[PDB]
Each structure stands twice: as structure tokens, then as C-alpha cells.
């Protein structure tokens, strides 16, 4: 049984005939094994049983309330101040609540990108994640859509970890570039060369590979030729007749169809990685946002909770109960209760979760969730000391 003293609101749990003071309702439920609510009694009634030692986990949350919303939404945002200066400052926000997206803060379009720095190296950020880039040769990076005037701005450790590494911002290497083609094409069209065919939609460019030909967009055709033209002043025009017979392959160039547009960080200081998964979805969806401020409502902007011994300001609409999957380094499933102040507390297993009254956890991304300051693990074993 579980009692609350009417005079003091103090909790007591009855264990093996002794009343034990207990620090919080969370701890009481861990020791009882079910999400009990206290029975109110007059203070003097508690004198009728022998009093034992205090039990529970002092740093646990008082209880474990969770917010109604079923869709799991987690967003990490970097905001940079003094972006052009010698000393930019980055702030990071963790947002676990629905967003309000608009033209001032929205997903990067397929031809938009952000140039950033982290630990002395440079990366291109697109909708998909981050891509290594070497700014040593700016003629080369120009042909890959980066203007010579573009300068990187810093990202946070948290943002670097959250953005998936999608591979380098470069043309895929072509093995045997310069060697004669084995496809029956004219001798000038060596491996790694570009040609075109006229279509009703205009020119279609192709690159010659060891094992076939691959369609490339105009931007990629230009970048190929900028790096190595193989002696050709322009892509030779071939007839469909000669080409349709050749094996078609894929050439996985990262370059978008439209000329790349590089985001001005002084104008658009906010960069976010947004993740979401709804009940019953097979996989989550994520995207990168860019814009003027956090993707939250006018009034939500004032509700942030700074984690002083943490790294982020947290924006939450109530508690959360989440499941993570991470390679630590072996594949590990873990659960956390998140209190309404953004503190995460481990929940070791489903039996323990259910004793606390925490029904199915929501899948969430460890890259964002583990940025939250961690409190004590909520375990019966800890509670019973
Ligand atoms: Ni005892
Ligand atoms: Ni706005
Ligand atoms: Ni936009
Ligand atoms: Ni556009």
C-alpha cells in the first residue's frame, strides 16, 4: 500500500509490515510494481504501524506524466550569431513538439545548400545530410556549384553528429578514365568523356563508363568536363541509333539539376535537422531546415528551458517516453523517460516502464535525445535501497 499524509503531503509505502517514507511517487511505483495512487490518511493514522527507513531514488522526477501526442517529433536546431566575424557563436535547441514551418524557416530545397565548418574541416549540408568538401581548389569547387565568394560558418558538435555523412561533395571517381571505350563508340569518346544525344526535351548528356553509358544532368556534364575534358572542346552529338544499343548504367553524381544556391548564414542563421515518425510507420522521415529563427510558434519562442549543465535549450510540451536504437558500439535498444524540464531518465525494461504506468514508448532519434542531461536510472533495485 501507498499512503499520503494529509497534513504534509509526504508519501509512505507499506513494505513487509513497515511504513517507509519514500521520496517520490515514481519511486513508490517502482517498489510496488504498479502505477498506484496514494491513499490519503490523517497524520496520526500513520502512528499505527512501525516506521522504517526512507526508500527511493531522490533525483527521480516526482511522477512520470507524458504528453498526449502520438506522432514522435524531434528537432535539433543550431543558431549562429556573428556569422561573418572572427568569433561566431553557436547556440543549440532541442525541440520535441509540433513545428510551425513557413517561408522564413523551412526545408532546404533540392538545389539549396549550406557550407559549414567543424573541427577545421568543411562540409556541404543538403536535405540529405552532410557531405565532405575540400576548398583547396576553388575552381574545382566552383564547377561543383560553390561560388568562390562562399564562406563556411560553424556548426555545433550536436548538429555534426545528427547530420548523416552522405559522402563527399565530389564527382564519383571513374575507374580507367582516359582509356579507350569498349562500347563501340567513336575513339574520341574515351572512358570518362561526355557526349550528348538530341531529344524532344533537348540535349541529354551521357558519361562513358567502363561498363556502359550513364545519363548525367547538365550541371554534372559541366563538372565532368571542367575536371577532365579528355581533349574535347564540347560534348560530341551522337545519334540515338548508335546509343540505344549500349548498356545503360547509373552515375551517382550528387549535383542537383538546378544551379546550386548557397544559403547566406547571416540572413538565415538557423539550421535544423528534423526527425519524425508516426505510430505504425515502418521508418522515420528526416529533413534539414534553414531559415531566420526556430521553427516554432510565436509564443513557444519564449518557453525554452536552458540546460545549464547541458548543451541545449529545450522546447517541450510535456513529458515523453521514448525508445532509442544505437550502436554503442553493438546495436543497443534503450528507453528513457523525459520529464517536462527535458531531463532524461533511463528505464531499463518494459516491466519497469509498466510499473510506472508508461505505455508504449515512442521511437525517437538518439542523436537528439542523448543531448538531454541524464538523471538517475529508474530501477526497482535503486528504489529499494
Ligand atoms: Ni525496511
Ligand atoms: Ni519568420
Ligand atoms: Ni527555405
Ligand atoms: Ni529554388
Author numbering: 74 to 458
Paper text:
The ESX-1 type VII secretion system is an important determinant of virulence in pathogenic mycobacteria, including Mycobacterium tuberculosis. This complicated molecular machine secretes folded proteins through the mycobacterial cell envelope to subvert the host immune response. All ESX gene clusters contain at least three or four ESX conserved components (Ecc), named EccB, EccC, and EccD, with EccE being present in all ESX systems with the exception of ESX-4. In this study we report the molecular structures of the periplasmic domain of EccB1 and the cytoplasmic domain of EccD1 from the ESX-1 cluster.
